[PDB]
């Protein structure tokens, strides 16, 4: 009983370091969560029942998503390799179930987060300033690494505590995250993290109400508008570019970064309108482009992209209305569960549970914002990291709220 808790708090402490710093750390963490499950031999049947207000919605959402993706492959004969990445979201079920069976200590998650962030900063600094690398990602893809950095920085920003030494240990998390993100480019992750950290400022300060948030976002908007009124400001330099890009797209000159991605979106949405219920199927987005009228009369980069670069548009065009609903569910059901746990924790006091729920909600929001400009299911590392993090956070939050 006690060893199950100790070997689980050690695992939650080591999870960020394994995921980021260790090369094959995802497999190591999977083996760790699977060997903890082999010691829950006598339990794990009396763990699901009392935590069925949190475990069952997650299991139902994951099973429905898997069934929809399998049914969008049975009807449209596709190679089985298109569902390997979706097959990795089943690990959220296992992670949450293991966590709820063996109660961890959430106080060791935050120290693990900050240690992982610091060590990843050191690794990226070495991989950029000495072994010159264009985009210094530790051992994985740049996009997946950036998403992991953003998610873990948000998690670390939700430090449970009020002492002066805790706020300066949570702002350091954002500082390390933004340094790591700027080291490997991918400014979109920086923008997403900075945007989604503003709602987190209510979790961060248990004095910061909603009016103080409305005025804060008003001040941010005023600062953003002030930049556009300075003629030489770089913000006006990267905003006028997008404005001119939109204007060029509104006539025939669609051969640009904004224009190319606003043209695959239109082709995807026009096909989704044609076939609402069943699209081409899971994956197979290239069929929409190759059967389109624009590609048959124009030679451009928009006809070579394997998949769309927006999660909602890609899901709607490829796997239809049921697939769109289940894809939105994979990100909305955890949000509802986190809100339900946060409300109970706040009604009970217990600042650790409230901070955990806030961190989960921020992770969900950041994942949605990232999916606004990319497909999360494309990268296996991103999928497995998201599944594991959501499972662990949901399990710990449910354990804190229920008891």
């Amino acid at each position, epitope marked *: 009983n006690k060893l199950l808790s100790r070997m689980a708090t050690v695992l939650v402490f080591a999870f960020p370091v394994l995921i980021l710093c260790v090369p094959r750390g995802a497999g190591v963490f999977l083996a760790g969560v699977g060997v903890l499950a082999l010691l829950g031999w006598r339990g794990m049947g009396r763990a699901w029942r009392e935590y069925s207000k949190v475990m069952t919605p997650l299991a139902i959402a994951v099973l429905a998503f898997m069934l929809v993706y399998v049914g969008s492959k049975l009807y449209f004969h596709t190679p089985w390799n298109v569902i390997d990445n979706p097959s990795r979201t089943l690990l959220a079920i296992l992670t949450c179930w293991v966590i709820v069976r063996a109660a961890p200590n959430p106080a060791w998650l935050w120290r693990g987060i900050t240690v992982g962030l610091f060590l990843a900063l050191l690794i990226v600094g070495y991989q950029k300033f000495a072994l010159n690398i*264009d*985009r210094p990602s530790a051992w994985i893809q740049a996009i997946a690494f950036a998403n992991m950095i953003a998610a873990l920085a948000l998690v670390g920003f939700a430090r449970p505590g009020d002492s002066r030494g805790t706020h300066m240990e949570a702002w350091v998390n954002l500082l390390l995250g933004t340094m790591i993100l700027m080291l490997n480019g991918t400014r979109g992750a920086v923008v997403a993290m900075l945007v989604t950290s503003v709602p987190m400022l209510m979790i961060r300060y248990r004095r910061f109400s909603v009016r103080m948030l409305i005025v804060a976002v008003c001040a941010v908007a005023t600062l953003a508008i002030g930049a556009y009124m300075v003629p030489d400001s770089p913000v006006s330099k990267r905003v006028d570019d997008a404005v001119s890009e939109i204007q060029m797209y509104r006539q025939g000159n669609i051969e640009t970064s904004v224009g190319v991605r606003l043209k695959i979106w239109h082709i995807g949405l026009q096909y989704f309108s044609e076939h609402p219920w069943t699209g081409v199927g899971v994956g197979q987005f290239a069929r929409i482009l190759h059967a389109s009228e624009f590609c048959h009369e124009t*030679k451009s980069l928009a006809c070579v992209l394997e998949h769309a670069h927006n999660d909602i548009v890609e899901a709607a065009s490829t796997t239809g209305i049921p697939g769109l609903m289940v894809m939105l569910g994979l990100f909305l059901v955890p949000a509802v569960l986190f809100a339900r746990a946060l409300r109970a924790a706040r009604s009970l006091g217990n600042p650790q549970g409230v901070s955990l729920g806030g961190a989960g909600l921020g992770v969900v929001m950041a994942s949605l914002i990232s999916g606004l400009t990319q497909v999360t299911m494309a990268h296996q590392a991103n999928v497995v990291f998201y599944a594991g993090l959501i499972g662990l956070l949901l399990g710990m939050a449910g354990r804190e709220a229920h008891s």
Partner: antibody
Amino acid sequence: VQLVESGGGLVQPGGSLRLSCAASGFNVYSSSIHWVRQAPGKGLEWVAYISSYYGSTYYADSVKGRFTISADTSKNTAYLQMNSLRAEDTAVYYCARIMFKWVSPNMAFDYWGQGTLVT
Amino acid sequence: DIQMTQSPSSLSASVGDRVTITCRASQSVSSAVAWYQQKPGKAPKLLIYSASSLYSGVPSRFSGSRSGTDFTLTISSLQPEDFATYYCQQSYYSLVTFGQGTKV
């Protein structure tokens, strides 16, 4: 989208010459410009480039300290200032523009220039 | 820097027989390998980016693959306009490097 460069000619060793790479159909300060040279009857060789927005510059081993790459958003042109020329720098110099960052995370040249000959 | 070797340095094959080009790498370049085709006296044109994705206006005959640090381009069949030199590049390191350049 078009990249046009001019400025090649006869330069005695120890001289200086500037190559201007005028661009059209896109914005230079948004993307990045890479310079690639090819010696007569030999393979392609990279020399320098600039970053998208920050303007950070990197140079090859042979040309560092003597080549000064720069950009001018007002005229939407990219320049490579060549200094302390030697007989080993005779090549045809091409421009290059990387693909969209979201399409390819790493740099890959998609539109090139017509190339200029420097002796 | 990072050094690549291409083999063969120059090959000769008739039309219809598939050819494969091997590009090596001194150090570990993950996926930042691009392939170009240069015809005599003209600017090179991009063929494959990220070692497995074709570019616009490139026939489906061209295809690339990765096996660890062994990057290989293959052509399903040679049409009369497929006779040109090919190069392989790394973009993982900040100082990019082109291959020696095979010839068909």
